[PDB]
């Protein structure tokens, strides 16, 4: 993604060492998981709430006439 090869050897392989594992991507990291669960629900609260894996179909209405 970026450069220097001895330092980046330490890091760029460590980009993908994380990705070079995917059940806990050499660490998902319990803290990451915990705060993730916090923000993911809290995000949900900060969102609109009508389930995000469901289609909001239509509604119908009838306007004032005298």
């Amino acid at each position: 993604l970026d450069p220097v090869q001895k330092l980046f050897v330490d890091k760029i392989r460590e980009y993908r060492t994380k990705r070079q594992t995917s059940g806990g991507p050499v660490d998902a990291g319990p803290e990451y998981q915990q705060d993730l669960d916090r923000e993911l629900f809290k995000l949900k609260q900060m969102y609109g709430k009508a389930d995000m894996n469901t289609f909001p179909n239509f509604t119908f209405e009838d306007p004032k006439f005298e």
Binding site: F55, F58, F60, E61, D62, F65, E66
Partner: protein, 61 residues
């Protein structure tokens, strides 16, 4: 994922009624009251109108 796709077809597929009537006696609550408006009061009103016109003839003598 597949949410957007599911939604895609389903949204592109999802359809809508069009909002009800209430009060459309007007089309009718017209024409009958319209017969009162026009014809019934009209004709009577012309019948009035004529007598004065005939009598303004008379008053022209």
């Amino acid at each position: 994922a597949g949410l957007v796709d599911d939604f895609e077809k389903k949204f592109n597929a999802l359809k809508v009624p069009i909002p009800e009537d209430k009060y459309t006696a007007q089309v009718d609550a017209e024409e009958k009251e319209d017969v009162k408006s026009c014809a019934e009061f009209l004709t009577q009103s012309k019948t009035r109108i004529q007598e004065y016109e005939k009598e303004l003839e008379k008053m022209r003598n």
